[PDB]
Amino acid sequence: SAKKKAILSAALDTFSQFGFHGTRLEQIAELAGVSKTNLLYYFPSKEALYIAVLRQILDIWLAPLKAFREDFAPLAAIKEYIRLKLEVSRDYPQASRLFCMEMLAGAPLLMDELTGDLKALIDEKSALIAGWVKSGKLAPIDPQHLIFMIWASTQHYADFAPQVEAVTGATLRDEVFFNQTVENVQRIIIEGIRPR
Amino acid sequence: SAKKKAILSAALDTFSQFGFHGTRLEQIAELAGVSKTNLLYYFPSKEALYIAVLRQILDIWLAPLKAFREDFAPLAAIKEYIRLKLEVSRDYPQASRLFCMEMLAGAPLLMDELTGDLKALIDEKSALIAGWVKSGKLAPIDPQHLIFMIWASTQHYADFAPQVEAVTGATLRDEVFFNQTVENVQRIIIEGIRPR
Numbered sequence: 001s002a003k004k005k006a007i008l009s010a011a012l013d014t015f016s017q018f019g020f021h022g023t024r025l026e027q028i029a030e031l032a033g034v035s036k037t038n039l040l041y042y043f044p045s046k047e048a049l050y051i052a053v054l055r056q057i058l059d060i061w062l063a064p065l066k067a068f069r070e071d072f073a074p075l076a077a078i079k080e081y082i083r084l085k086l087e088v089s090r091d092y093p094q095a096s097r098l099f100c101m102e103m104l105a106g107a108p109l110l111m112d113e114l115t116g117d118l119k120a121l122i123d124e125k126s127a128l129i130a131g132w133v134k135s136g137k138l139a140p141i142d143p144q145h146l147i148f149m150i151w152a153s154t155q156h157y158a159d160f161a162p163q164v165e166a167v168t169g170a171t172l173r174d175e176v177f178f179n180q181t182v183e184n185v186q187r188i189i190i191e192g193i194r195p196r
Numbered sequence: 197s198a199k200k201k202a203i204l205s206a207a208l209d210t211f212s213q214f215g216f217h218g219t220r221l222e223q224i225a226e227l228a229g230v231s232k233t234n235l236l237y238y239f240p241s242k243e244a245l246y247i248a249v250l251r252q253i254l255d256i257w258l259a260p261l262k263a264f265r266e267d268f269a270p271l272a273a274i275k276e277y278i279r280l281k282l283e284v285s286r287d288y289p290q291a292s293r294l295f296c297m298e299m300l301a302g303a304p305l306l307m308d309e310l311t312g313d314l315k316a317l318i319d320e321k322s323a324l325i326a327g328w329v330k331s332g333k334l335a336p337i338d339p340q341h342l343i344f345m346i347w348a349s350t351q352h353y354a355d356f357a358p359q360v361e362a363v364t365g366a367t368l369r370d371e372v373f374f375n376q377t378v379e380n381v382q383r384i385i386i387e388g389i390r391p392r
């Protein structure tokens with residue numbers, strides 16, 4: 001059995017409901033079917049567990065962007081990235097919300113992950129996208145700002161779901177709304193970067 | 197209005213630091229240079245004050261969208277809206293962050309503002325943008341999703357500033373970065389909606 005995974009999943013739900021400071025390791029333990037000491041065998045502190053949870057989300061989010069290669073068809077790759085990001089917003093919204101919460105507080109526990117591994121990845125893949133700009137496979141846009149727009153637009157549907165629901169009546173659990181959302185976000189970003 | 201303003205601004209800072217539940221009216225009062233009973237002449241409860249803080253940022257955010265009229269040149273109006281939203285992200289980031297925080301928690305106190313006045317505005321201005329779609333002044337996009345993209349892409353630079361800074365080295369207080377940000381967000385969205 002996958003007790004580490006059960007703890008991570010329980011932690012996500014607890015952290016998302018109570019925040020870092022309000023959350024007690026006893027709450028997570030009980031939710032995951034383990035004792036507090038058992039939990040401490042996998043994660044030596046609440047801090048370590050929290051960082052582990054946010055690393056899970058990062059890996060899920062960044063998987064498609066890691067996969068980008070020079071020889072990929074740029075528009076198709078970016079279309080697919082948008083779709084996959086929206087699937088994450090549909091399937092792991094509480095994680096998206098927790099990551100956002102950490103940013104709102106100034107990234108006190110996650111800053112190192114952003115300045116190190118994230119920055120290095122985005123430099124690498126920005127150069128790759130810049131190469132597509134120079135080839136004329138994309139219109140002249142800044143790679144970093146393109147990336148941020150993908151992140152912001154796709155994560156909005158989870159992080160701002162109450163507002164989305166108030167305005168539209170819907171959520172990403174509605175299959176028709178999910179599809180419309182994918183089509184429109186793709187339409188705007190893709191037509192914005194298509195070479196003319 | 198100088199005391200009402202001082203209370204609102206003190207409230208923003210206190211709420212941001214301590215959260216809704218941890219904040220006491222006596223903390224805000226002292227930070228604003230007024231007595232608790234003077235504060236209560238302006239705002240009869242902590243809840244009412246919290247909602248007012250978030251109403252300040254709504255009004256600021258929504259001013260350009262309120263101004264939209266049928267006869268406006270659609271691309272120029274949307275370009276300008278994007279710029280103005282980024283100015284707000286530069287100038288009132290802590291308010292953007294508090295509004296985001298309220299959404300992340302499910303909008304427990306702000307829901308009425310969203311279902312009433314906001315929804316009514318967005319319906320009105322979505323119909324107005326739909327009219328521009330039907331005229332051929334914009335490419336066929338969904339108005340609501342366009343609006344959400346403007347919101348998400350512009351608010352990202354405040355709400356996710358630590359990440360933006362980790363990746364780029366910059367903030368919206370850097371004049372060159374601010375200018376690049378405006379240009380690229382406009383480039384992507386405007387080219388995405390330009391009629392072909």
Ligand SMILES: O=C1CCNC(=O)N1
Nearest residue numbers: 058061062151155359
């Ligand atoms: O996909 C991602 C990468 C990490 N940060 C972000 O906001 N979205």
Ligand SMILES: O=C1CCNC(=O)N1
Nearest residue numbers: 163254257258347351
């Ligand atoms: O621009 C806006 C106003 C409405 N709410 C929001 O998230 N941003």
